[PDB]
Amino acid sequence: NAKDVLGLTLLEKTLKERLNLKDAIIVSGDSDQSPWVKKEMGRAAVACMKKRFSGKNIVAVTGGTTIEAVAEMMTPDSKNRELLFVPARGGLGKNQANTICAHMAEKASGTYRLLFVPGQLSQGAYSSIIEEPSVKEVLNTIKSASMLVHGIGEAKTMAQRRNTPLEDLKKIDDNDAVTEAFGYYFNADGEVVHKVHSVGMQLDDIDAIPDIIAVAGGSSKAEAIEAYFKKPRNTVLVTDEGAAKKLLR
C-alpha cells in the first residue's frame, strides 16, 4: 500500500489522536516547498466531499488559495447528486469566496448563489441591506448549508493581507491571535479573539452543518492548524506532511 509505505496511515491515526478531528487526510509532501502539493490536497478534498454528499447539498465555501485549488480539481459528481454552492461569508467596509464558489459550481456542473459586494457604507445602510428580501434569501441559504469547505490561515498573514483597521490590528496582536478561519481570529487555545465585520456564516452556525472539511497545509501553518483544532469542530482535515510532521515532531 502507498499510504503504508509513505507512512501516511499511521500518521493520520496519530494526528486524529492529537487534534480535535473527525478524520485526518494527509497527502505527501510540504506545500510550502512543492507547489503542486496544494493540487493533491485539492484532489483529496474533492474526493472527500463526494463521499459525504447527500441527495441534495448546499455547499458553503471560503475564498483562499487552497480552496481555489479544491475548485480547480472539482469534477462532476458520478452519482449526479444535487449541488448548490454559496460563499460562506462576505466582508463589509471584492469577495474572493464568490469567485471560488462560481468556479467550483461550474466545475461540478452545479448551481450557485453569490453574495452582494457593497461599497463602503454606514452600519445603518448595511443593516437595511441585509433585510432586503433578495439578500436575505441568499443569507438564509447559507444558514441552510449542508457542507462547509474552508481554509485555515496564520492570523498575522491574513490580517495584513486584508485591509485591516489599525485599531483591529492592535486588538489582534494584543490578544495573541495565531490562526484564522472563515472570518474569525483565534488564539493558541482556539478561542475567538476577533471577528471580521461580515455577513453570512457565524461560528455558532458550524455546529449545525453536518459536514465540515478544512483544507490547509504546509509547514508554516502547523501552529495555526494546531490552534484552530484545540477545540472540537467536528471537522475532517485535509492536510499534507509538511504540516502534519511539523505538528507531530
Ligand X SMILES: O=C[C@@H](O)COP(=O)(O)O
Which residues sit in the known binding site? 63-66, 89, 96, 161-162, 180, 221
Question: Which residue number, 11 or 88, has a Cβ lying nearer to ligand X?
Answer: 88
The reply on whether position 66 binds ligand X by CB under 6 A is: yes
The reply on whether position 65 binds ligand X by CB under 6 A is: yes
Contact 236, 213 (CB under 8 A): yes
- Residue range at the interface with ligand X (CB under 6 A); choices 26-34, 56-64, 125-133, 164-172: 56-64
Gap between the Cα atoms of 222 and 237, Å rounded: 12
Residues 154-173 interacting with ligand X (rule: CB under 6 A): 158
Helices within the chain (DSSP H only)? 2-5, 8-18, 37-52, 65-73, 96-108, 123-130, 133-143, 155-161, 166-174, 222-228, 241-248
Gap between the Cα atoms of 184 and 204, Å rounded: 12
Which residue, 211, 219, 210, is CA-closest to 237? 211
The reply on whether position 64 binds ligand X by CB under 6 A is: yes
When CB distances are held under 5 to 8 angstroms depending on the partner's kind, the choice from ligand X, Cl ion, a copy of itself, none that residue 30 binds is Cl ion
Gap between the Cα atoms of 229 and 110, Å rounded: 31
Q: How far is the CB of 103 from a copy of itself (least distance, A)?
A: 18
Question: Which residue number, 4 or 204, has a Cβ lying nearer to a copy of itself?
Answer: 4
Residues annotated in a binding site for beta-D-fructose 1,6-bisphosphate: 63-66, 89, 96, 161-162, 180, 221
Residues lying near a copy of itself in the complex (CB under 8 A): 1-9, 12, 25-29, 34, 36, 39-40, 43-44, 47-48, 51
Gap between the Cα atoms of 41 and 147, Å rounded: 18
Contact 19, 233 (CB under 8 A): no
Other CB atoms within 10 Å distance of the CB of residue 216: 25
The reply on whether position 180 binds ligand X by CB under 6 A is: yes
Helix (H, G, I), strand (E, B) or coil at 186: strand
**Planar angle of CA 59, 109, 215, nearest 5 degrees:** 40
Q: How far is the CB of 39 from a copy of itself (least distance, A)?
A: 7
CA 116 to chain centre: 20
- Residue range at the interface with ligand X (CB under 6 A); choices 4-12, 64-72, 125-133, 167-175: 64-72
Among 113, 143, 162, 245, indicate the residue that binds Cl ion (CB under 5 A): 113
When CB distances are held under 5 to 8 angstroms depending on the partner's kind, the choice from Cl ion, a copy of itself, ligand X, none that residue 79 binds is none
The reply on whether position 152 binds ligand X by CB under 6 A is: yes
Residues lying near ligand X in the complex (CB under 6 A) are found at 62-66, 151-153, 158, 180-181
